[PDB]
């Protein structure tokens, strides 16, 4: 298969390895008590939390983010973070997403003993700010739910395990004029079975895929480990979001299609 190396980033079960809609793929002990926490290795572009107050406010009059500190480590700009770690060569040059992830993982809630609990974070591309999330909960149907939304399009949900080479091994852009397929005997065949959801544009298709994707918590043993309906073939002409749950192994050239994933940005194409 000539597509092997290229299609590696779309093996979400392998490269991400956790829930996407709701990421709770690991556990960590804080002062004698185990807690669930995000552990996906890829960044989730466009993911935010809808409260039914925005969730990026510091922790009903508060949100999910870290409370004010001295000095202020949350929220912290990209330049603020690079200046903060200017003596650390292993950190200061990290990309904005990994750096935000490592910055959040630098704060230990257990001030008595070193623990494994590392807070998730959201990087806002709009004002280049890293928000450390004090609340790792993602759905409770004080009710809230995870979603991709126009308001969240510049948000990026980051677990503690976001790899520093996500640009190389994780999805971001949607593939224009391309259709996910399965490589069989020297040819890229169509996904034999897909679940068709109607969608007005690419954004709504990406939104639908996210809603159906790998989740580590049932809506309304729980770990998905990356398994789920993570991919979608969007036919822009028929306005169909063709959603499936098996990894694609090749691409098909088709001008009517845009290949998207639950991890991918809801707008960007290449």
């Amino acid at each position: 298969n000539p597509w092997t190396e290229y299609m590696a980033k779309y093996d979400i079960e392998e490269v991400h390895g956790s829930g996407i809609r709701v990421d709770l793929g690991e556990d960590a002990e804080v002062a004698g008590t185990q807690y669930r926490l995000p552990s996906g290795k890829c960044p989730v572009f466009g993911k935010g939390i809808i409260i039914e107050t925005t969730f990026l406010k510091p922790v009903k009059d508060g949100g999910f983010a870290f409370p004010p500190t001295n000095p202020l480590i949350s929220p912290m700009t990209l330049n603020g973070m690079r200046d903060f770690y200017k003596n650390n060569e292993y950190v200061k040059n990290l990309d904005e997403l990994t750096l935000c992830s490592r910055h959040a993982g630098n704060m230990n809630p257990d001030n008595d003993k070193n623990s494994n609990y590392k807070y998730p974070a959201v990087y806002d591309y709009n004002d280049k700010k890293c928000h450390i999330l004090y609340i790792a909960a993602q759905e409770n149907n004080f009710c809230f739910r995870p979603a991709k939304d126009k308001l969240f399009e510049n948000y990026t949900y980051l677990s503690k395990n976001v790899v520093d080479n996500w640009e190389e091994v994780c999805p971001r852009k949607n593939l224009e004029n391309a259709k996910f397929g399965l490589w069989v005997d020297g040819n890229c065949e169509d996904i034999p079975h897909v679940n068709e959801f109607s969608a007005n544009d690419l954004f709504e298709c990406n939104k639908l895929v996210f809603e159906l994707s790998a989740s580590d918590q049932p809506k309304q043993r729980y770990k998905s480990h990356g398994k789920g309906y993570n991919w979608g073939n969007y036919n822009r002409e028929t306005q169909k979001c063709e959603i499936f749950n098996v990894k694609p192994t090749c691409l098909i050239n088709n001008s009517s299609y845009i290949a998207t994933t639950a991890l991918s940005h809801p707008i960007e194409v290449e």
């Binding site: 500190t69 001295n70 000095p71 770690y85 650390n88 630098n106 704060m107 230990n108 257990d110 001030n111």
Partner: peptide, 13 residues
């Protein structure tokens, strides 16, 4: 209050 894991370790409250 939190504790920085990386050097220098310090307490941020």
């Amino acid at each position: 209050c939190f504790t920085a894991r990386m050097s220098p370790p310090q307490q941020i409250c």
